[PDB]
Coordinates of C-alpha atoms in Angstrom, one line a residue:
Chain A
X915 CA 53.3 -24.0 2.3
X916 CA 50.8 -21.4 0.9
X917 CA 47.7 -20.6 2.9
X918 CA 45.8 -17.7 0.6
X919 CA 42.1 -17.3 0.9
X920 CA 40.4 -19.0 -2.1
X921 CA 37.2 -21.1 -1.9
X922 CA 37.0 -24.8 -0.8
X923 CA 35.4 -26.3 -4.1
X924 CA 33.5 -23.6 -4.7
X925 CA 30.7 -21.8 -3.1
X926 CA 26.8 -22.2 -3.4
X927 CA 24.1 -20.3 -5.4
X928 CA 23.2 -16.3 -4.1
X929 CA 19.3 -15.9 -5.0
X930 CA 18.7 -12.7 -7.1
X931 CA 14.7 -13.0 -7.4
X932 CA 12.9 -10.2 -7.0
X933 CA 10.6 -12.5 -4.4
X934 CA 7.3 -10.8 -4.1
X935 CA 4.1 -12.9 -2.9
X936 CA 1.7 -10.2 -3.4
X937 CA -0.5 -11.7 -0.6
X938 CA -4.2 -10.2 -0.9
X939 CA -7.5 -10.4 -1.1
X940 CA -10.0 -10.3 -4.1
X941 CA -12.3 -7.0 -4.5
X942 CA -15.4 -9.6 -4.4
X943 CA -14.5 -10.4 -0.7
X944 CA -13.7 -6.9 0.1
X945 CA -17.0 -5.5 -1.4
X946 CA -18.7 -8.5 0.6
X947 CA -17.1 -7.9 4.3
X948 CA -17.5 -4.3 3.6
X949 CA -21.4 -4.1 2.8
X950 CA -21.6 -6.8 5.5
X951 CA -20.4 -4.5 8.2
X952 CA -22.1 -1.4 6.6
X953 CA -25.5 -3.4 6.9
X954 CA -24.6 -4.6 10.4
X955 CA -23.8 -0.9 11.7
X956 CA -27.1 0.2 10.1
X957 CA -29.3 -2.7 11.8
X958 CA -28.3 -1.9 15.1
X959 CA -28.8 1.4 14.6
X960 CA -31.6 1.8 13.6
X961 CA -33.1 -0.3 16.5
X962 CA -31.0 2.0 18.8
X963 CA -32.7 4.8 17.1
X964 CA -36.3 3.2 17.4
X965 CA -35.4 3.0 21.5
X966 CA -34.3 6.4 21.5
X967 CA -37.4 8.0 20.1
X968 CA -39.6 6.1 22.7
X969 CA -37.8 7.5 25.8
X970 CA -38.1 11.1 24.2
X971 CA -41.6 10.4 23.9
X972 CA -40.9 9.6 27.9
X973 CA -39.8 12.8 28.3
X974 CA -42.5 14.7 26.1
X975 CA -45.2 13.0 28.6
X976 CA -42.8 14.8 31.5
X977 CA -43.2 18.1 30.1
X978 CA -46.4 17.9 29.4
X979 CA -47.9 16.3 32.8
X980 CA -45.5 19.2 34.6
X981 CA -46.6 22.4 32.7
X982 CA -49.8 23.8 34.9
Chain B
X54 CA 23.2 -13.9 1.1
X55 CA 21.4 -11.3 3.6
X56 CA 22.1 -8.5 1.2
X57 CA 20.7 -10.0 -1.2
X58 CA 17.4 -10.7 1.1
X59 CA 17.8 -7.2 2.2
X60 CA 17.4 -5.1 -1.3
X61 CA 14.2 -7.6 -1.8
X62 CA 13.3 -5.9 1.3
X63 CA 13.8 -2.5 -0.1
X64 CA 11.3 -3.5 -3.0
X65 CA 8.9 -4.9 -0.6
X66 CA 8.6 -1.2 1.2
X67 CA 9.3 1.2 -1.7
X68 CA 8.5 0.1 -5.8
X69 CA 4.6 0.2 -6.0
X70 CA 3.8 2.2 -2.7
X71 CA 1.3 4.7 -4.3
X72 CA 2.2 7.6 -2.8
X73 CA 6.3 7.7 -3.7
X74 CA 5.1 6.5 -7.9
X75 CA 2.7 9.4 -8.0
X76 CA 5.0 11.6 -6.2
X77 CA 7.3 10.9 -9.0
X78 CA 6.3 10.3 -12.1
X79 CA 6.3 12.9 -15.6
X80 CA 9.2 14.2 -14.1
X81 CA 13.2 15.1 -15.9
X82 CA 12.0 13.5 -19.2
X83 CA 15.2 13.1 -21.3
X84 CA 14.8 12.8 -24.9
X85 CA 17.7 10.8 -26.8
X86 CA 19.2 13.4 -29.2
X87 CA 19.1 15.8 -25.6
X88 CA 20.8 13.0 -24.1
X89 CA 23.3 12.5 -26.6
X90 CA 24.7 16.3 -26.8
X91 CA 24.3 17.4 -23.3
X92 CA 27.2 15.2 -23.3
X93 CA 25.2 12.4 -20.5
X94 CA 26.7 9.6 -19.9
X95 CA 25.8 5.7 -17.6
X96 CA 22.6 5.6 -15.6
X97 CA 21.0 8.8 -17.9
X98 CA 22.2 6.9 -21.0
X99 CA 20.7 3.8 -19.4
X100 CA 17.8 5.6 -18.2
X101 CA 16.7 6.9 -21.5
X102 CA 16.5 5.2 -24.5
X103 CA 20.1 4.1 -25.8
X104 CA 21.7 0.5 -25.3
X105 CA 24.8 1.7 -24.0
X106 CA 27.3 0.2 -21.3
X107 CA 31.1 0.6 -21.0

């Protein structure tokens, strides 16, 4: 007999797409989640800093009680 | 078949990453007649200009 290597009726299809899905976002969501957590930080901070300035006021009272 | 999926993975992590394009950009430009008789020949040939291919 004669047992060479070819094919079996042919072989099947070898993809040559350059398969990109550029999976994103859009710059409106971006600008939106961005000045959303921007406004968030600045909220809470500015309570925290509220706070803050009371308790030094604590300590101005401390001082000032103390001093004779 | 995997190679295939492979060099689309090459493109995925090179080919538009900002920092290797503006690494190399202005860089080796080749005008035709220079190409022609600096005796270049394939990819530079390719690479610049002329419709050449053995």
């Amino acid at each position: 007999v004669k047992q060479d290597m070819p094919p079996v009726g042919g072989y099947g299809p070898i993809d040559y797409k350059r398969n990109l899905p550029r999976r994103g976002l859009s710059g409106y969501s971006m600008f939106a989640v961005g000045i959303g957590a921007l406004l968030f930080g600045y909220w809470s901070m500015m309570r925290w800093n509220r706070e803050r300035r009371r308790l030094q006021i604590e300590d101005f009272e401390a001082r000032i009680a103390l001093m004779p | 078949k995997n190679f295939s999926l492979r060099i689309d993975e090459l493109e995925e992590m090179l080919t538009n990453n900002r920092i290797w394009r503006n690494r190399t950009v202005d860089i080796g430009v080749v005008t035709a007649e220079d190409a022609l008789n600096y005796g270049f020949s394939g990819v530079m040939l390719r690479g610049s200009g002329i419709q050449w291919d053995l």
